[PDB]
Amino acid sequence: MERNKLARQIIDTCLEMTRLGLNQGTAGNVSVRYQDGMLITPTGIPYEKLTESHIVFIDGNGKHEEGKLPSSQWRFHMAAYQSRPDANAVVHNHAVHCTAVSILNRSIPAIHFMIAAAGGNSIPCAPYATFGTRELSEHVALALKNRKATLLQHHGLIACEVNLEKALWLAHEVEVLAQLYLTTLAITDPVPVLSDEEIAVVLEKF
Amino acid sequence: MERNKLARQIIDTCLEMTRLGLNQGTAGNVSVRYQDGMLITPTGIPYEKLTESHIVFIDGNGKHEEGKLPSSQWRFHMAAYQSRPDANAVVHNHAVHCTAVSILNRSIPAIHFMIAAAGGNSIPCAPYATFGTRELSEHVALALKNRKATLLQHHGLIACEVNLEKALWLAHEVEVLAQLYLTTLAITDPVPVLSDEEIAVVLEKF
Amino acid sequence: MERNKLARQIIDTCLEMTRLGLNQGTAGNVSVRYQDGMLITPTGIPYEKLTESHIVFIDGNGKHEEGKLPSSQWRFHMAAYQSRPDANAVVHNHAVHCTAVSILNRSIPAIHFMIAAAGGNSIPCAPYATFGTRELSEHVALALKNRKATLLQHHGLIACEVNLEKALWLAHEVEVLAQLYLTTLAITDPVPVLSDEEIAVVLEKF
Amino acid sequence: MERNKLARQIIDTCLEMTRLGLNQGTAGNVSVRYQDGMLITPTGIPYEKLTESHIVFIDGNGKHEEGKLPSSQWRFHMAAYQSRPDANAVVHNHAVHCTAVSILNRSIPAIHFMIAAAGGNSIPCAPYATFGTRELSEHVALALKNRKATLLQHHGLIACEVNLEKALWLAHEVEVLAQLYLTTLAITDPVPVLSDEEIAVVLEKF
Numbered sequence: 001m002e003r004n005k006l007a008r009q010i011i012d013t014c015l016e017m018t019r020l021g022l023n024q025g026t027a028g029n030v031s032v033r034y035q036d037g038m039l040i041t042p043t044g045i046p047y048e049k050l051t052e053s054h055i056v057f058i059d060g061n062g063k064h065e066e067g068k069l070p071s072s073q074w075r076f077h078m079a080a081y082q083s084r085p086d087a088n089a090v091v092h093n094h095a096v097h098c099t100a101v102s103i104l105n106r107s108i109p110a111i112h113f114m115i116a117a118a119g120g121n122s123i124p125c126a127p128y129a130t131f132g133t134r135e136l137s138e139h140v141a142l143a144l145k146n147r148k149a150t151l152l153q154h155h156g157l158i159a160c161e162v163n164l165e166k167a168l169w170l171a172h173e174v175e176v177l178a179q180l181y182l183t184t185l186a187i188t189d190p191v192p193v194l195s196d197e198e199i200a201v202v203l204e205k206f
Numbered sequence: 207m208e209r210n211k212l213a214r215q216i217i218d219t220c221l222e223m224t225r226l227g228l229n230q231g232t233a234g235n236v237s238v239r240y241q242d243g244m245l246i247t248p249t250g251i252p253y254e255k256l257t258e259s260h261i262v263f264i265d266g267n268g269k270h271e272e273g274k275l276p277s278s279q280w281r282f283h284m285a286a287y288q289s290r291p292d293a294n295a296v297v298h299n300h301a302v303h304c305t306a307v308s309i310l311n312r313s314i315p316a317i318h319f320m321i322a323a324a325g326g327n328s329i330p331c332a333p334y335a336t337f338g339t340r341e342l343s344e345h346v347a348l349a350l351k352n353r354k355a356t357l358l359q360h361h362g363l364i365a366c367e368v369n370l371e372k373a374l375w376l377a378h379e380v381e382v383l384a385q386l387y388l389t390t391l392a393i394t395d396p397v398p399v400l401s402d403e404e405i406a407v408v409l410e411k412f
Numbered sequence: 413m414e415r416n417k418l419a420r421q422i423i424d425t426c427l428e429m430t431r432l433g434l435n436q437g438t439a440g441n442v443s444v445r446y447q448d449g450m451l452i453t454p455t456g457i458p459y460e461k462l463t464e465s466h467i468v469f470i471d472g473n474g475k476h477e478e479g480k481l482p483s484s485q486w487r488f489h490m491a492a493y494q495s496r497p498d499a500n501a502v503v504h505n506h507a508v509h510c511t512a513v514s515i516l517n518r519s520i521p522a523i524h525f526m527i528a529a530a531g532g533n534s535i536p537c538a539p540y541a542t543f544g545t546r547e548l549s550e551h552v553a554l555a556l557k558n559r560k561a562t563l564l565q566h567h568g569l570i571a572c573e574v575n576l577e578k579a580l581w582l583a584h585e586v587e588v589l590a591q592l593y594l595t596t597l598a599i600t601d602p603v604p605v606l607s608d609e610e611i612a613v614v615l616e617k618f
Numbered sequence: 619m620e621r622n623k624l625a626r627q628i629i630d631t632c633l634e635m636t637r638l639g640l641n642q643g644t645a646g647n648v649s650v651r652y653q654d655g656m657l658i659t660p661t662g663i664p665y666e667k668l669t670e671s672h673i674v675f676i677d678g679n680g681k682h683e684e685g686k687l688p689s690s691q692w693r694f695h696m697a698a699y700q701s702r703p704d705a706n707a708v709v710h711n712h713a714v715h716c717t718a719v720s721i722l723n724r725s726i727p728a729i730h731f732m733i734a735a736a737g738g739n740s741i742p743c744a745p746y747a748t749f750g751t752r753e754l755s756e757h758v759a760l761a762l763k764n765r766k767a768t769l770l771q772h773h774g775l776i777a778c779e780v781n782l783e784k785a786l787w788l789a790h791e792v793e794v795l796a797q798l799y800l801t802t803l804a805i806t807d808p809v810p811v812l813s814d815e816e817i818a819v820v821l822e823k824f
Contacts, residue, residue: 025732025791094732096794100801103729103810111309112360113337114231114300128812130819131731154730154812173231176302183306186392186598186804192309194334194360201336317515318566319543320437320506379437382508389512392598392804398515400540400566407542523721524772525749526643526712585643588714595718598804604721606746606772613748 006032006039007055013164014047017093020172023047027094027156029071032164033081036060040077043069072132079137080160083144087160089167094156097178101125102151108174108181110194113202117173118149118159121199128153149174212238212245213261219370220253223299226378229253233300233362235277238370239287242266246283249275278338285343286366289350293366295373300362303384307331308357314380314387316400319408323379324355324365327405334359355380418444418451419467425576426459429505432584435459439506439568441483444576445493448472452489455481484544491549492572495556499572501579506568509590513537514563520586520593522606525614529585530561530571533611540565561586624650624657625673631782632665635711638790641665645712645774647689650782651699654678658695661687690750697755698778701762705778707785712774715796719743720769726792726799728812731820735791736767736777739817746771767792 010030017023017030026047031040037059045054056070062078064070071077073092080090101108108115108123115121126143129135140158143150149159149170157174161167184191194202216236223229223236232253237246243265251260262276268284270276277283279298286296307314314321314329321327332349335341346364349356355365355376363380367373390397400408422442429435429442438459443452449471457466468482474490476482483489485504492502513520520527520535527533538555541547552570555562561571561582569586573579596603606614628648635641635648644665649658655677663672674688680696682688689695691710698708719726726733726741733739744761747753758776761768767777767788775792779785802809812820 025794026787027732094794096797096801099730100798103798103802104805105810112305114233128816130816130823132823154810169232176231176300179302180306180309182801182805183302183388184309187310187388187395189805192311192360198334198336205336205338318511320439375438382437382506385508386512386515389508389594390515393516393594393601398517398566404540404542411542411544524717526645581644588643588712591714592718592721595714595800596721599722599800599807604723604772610746610748617748617750 003034003039003057004052006034007052009164010039010041010055011047011050011052013091013168014041014050016168017091017171018047020168022093022095022171022175024096025094029073029077029092030164030167031071031074031077031090033088038077038081040070040074043071075132075134075137076140076158079141080144080158083141084148084160086162087148088162089164090158090160091164091167091171092156092158093171095171095175095178097182098151098157098175099155100182101178102153102155102157105153108151108177109191110199111181111184111191112177113194113199114173115177115194116199116202116206117170119147120203121196123147123149123151123174123177125151125153128155131155151178209240209245209263210258212240213258215370216245216247216261217253217256217258219297219374220247220256222374223297223377224253226374228299228301228377228381230302231300235279235283235298236370236373237277237280237283237296239294244283244287246276246280249277281338281340281343282346282364285347286350286364289347290354290366292368293354294368295370296364296366297370297373297377298362298364299377301377301381301384303388304357304363304381305361306388307384308359308361308363311359314357314383315397316405317387317390317397318383319400319405320379321383321400322405322408322412323376325353326409327402329353329355329357329380329383331357331359334361337361357384415446415451415469416464418446419464421576422451422453422467423459423462423464425503425580426453426462428580429503429583430459432580434505434507434583434587436508437506441485441489441504442576443483443486443489443502445500450489450493452482452486455483487544487546487549488552488570491553492556492570495553496560496572498574499560500574501576502570502572503576503579503583504568504570505583507583507587507590509594510563510569510587511567512594513590514565514567514569517565520563520589521603522611523593523596523603524589525606525611526585527589527606528611528614528618529582531559532615533608535559535561535563535586535589537563537565540567543567563590621652621657621675622670624652625670627782628657628659628673629665629668629670631709631786632659632668634786635709635789636665638786640711640713640789640793642714643712647691647695647710648782649689649692649695649708651706656695656699658688658692661689693750693752693755694758694776697759698762698776701759702766702778704780705766706780707782708776708778709782709785709789710774710776711789713789713793713796715800716769716775716793717773718800719796720771720773720775723771726769726795727809728817729799729802729809730795731812731817732791733795733812734817734820734824735788737765738821739814741765741767741769741792741795743769743771746773749773769796
């Protein structure tokens, strides 16, 4: 849990995300909670040229390391950390099914019992705001109060978890749910869902 | 046909399943019939770290090996073995097309002559019950009486066969049928099917 | 152009077909024109264990090599060779988009100018008949009179060409056209097409 | 920035394009601005056999290197260079989602803020004309006046940029937008879009 172990795992999560087909068009950014702020991927540099030394440190005040350029979306990574004290890693991407559900400005309802991995009976969609603004950070903060992952209207997905392995796994699970949702919505609307009682049982079991 | 040969093939089926894109979100579990019970994949451990020694033995009484954690779904693997004496291997996954047909709570009708590989003119959908309960096991048992594969409502797929190679192949064939079904259902409902007479001919030929 | 050079290229076309995602559920069979009959893939043996010595020779009379089992579909490979004297290689598969168009029992109309690679302004769909029968061979023979590739109702695809490289390329092009067709048909029916005049120009240019 | 460095990068862009699944059916062609004309991929030769020496030089007058066959589409590569003086690389492909939107003869509207990477609030669709004609070149020229990428009706996609890395990235981004567009259009028409004001903000930010 030295800085370079964490910088390598960020990089492995970036490569893994591309492997899973969740980072189409190289839009992802990943961070982890570190000291008083976070370590995050940089802007510019393509994932495959990334080395430990490229990872940027952003302190609690939003001051980034000199000579480096943090991802343009660092502020909503910071907003997730302040909003969910249990989160230690955040994954952002523009996975196609999640992003298509974000364009329709729909929440994903309980069409599958794995919806409970994100903490309740849905995956919310936070309203649009221009990237990099305080207003976007505020919508992200509010959507993650009771959920570990949220869609971002006309944009993509944010998933947070206790470590990078689980944040990536969650992100992948939400992308499967989004695809399941869109494939069934084309056939029938509304899509059959599990009731609130059944999701209460599944949450108690998890 | 020693325990470790069977433990390695379980592991190869897990890797192969991921290769085929049937184990999206690492939800699969695989077992084989062994002695008086079965060998099954464990809970926890990600497929790529799996070694022969991780495979769990569950006897006929549901007593698992000490110091190991069997998959959370072991009971419906046991229910398949007791219900289909000819089955020697069971594959479970949450393949996206199968799972989307399971959400619509539809059986897959005879839209292609390969439907007969599962033993009749359809692929049933067993009703939902919370994972890991006796009630789920009962629905699985009844659906596999005359079929070798069944959808699981709001959940995924179970396929059984005489060995792991054929169980995996069947699972893959059902996922192609599910995708064929959903792609055509978007265009036209109902989807044209082969008659019962034609499926009788194909079954006699197989 | 010795038998083993041709047996290796059959095997390479099988591997390549799987690479392209056209041989989902390992249903393909490939042949080439040889001497008075053809060399074809066998039944049984999974593509990855295939060796030169597994390829079967079937003469002009339908007598296959002793000790080998030719693909169960050899007769419509023979029907293609007798029907199209210019064909020297035949590829059959159950590619998902082609097979979904075959289930709807539609021809693919001229939605893209590459439709002309198969010889006219469409890709026909031959009517269903049980696999391996003379009746299926007759429908294949008639559909390939003026086309180099045909859909097979409730079944899959047959593509023929002057060599294996081009037969595989054609098969792939028809699978792209099928997907283009189905993706657009979901939105609007009918799908806009190029006129017969325009396809005449493109054919003269090819 | 010697000829062979540029010939290798063309070849790497061809391989990369296939890796991304944008060159389905090996229809792509790539060029870069060189001296008074351009270096372009040849016709014939499959991408995997391509070597530096296969890349063709076409001067400003349309005279190609002796003993070589330039891509059949060289003229609309030349039309892009003359129409967009800032372009130094052009990518053409028949990516399936782009091509399906080109068949519907639709522009892609501002369903995602990344639409602004191509220079405005849409991705146009240039009208059909037979491949290789002056008339096609004219439609391409006019569509790229204020956009860096355009769909080509019943055909595919053209993307241009300051270097090959960015031209490929743009091409990929347009293919994600096309898929997002088609996946949402199946559910609801019209698809919700970002307003002209919001795209003005995003353009100023880029």
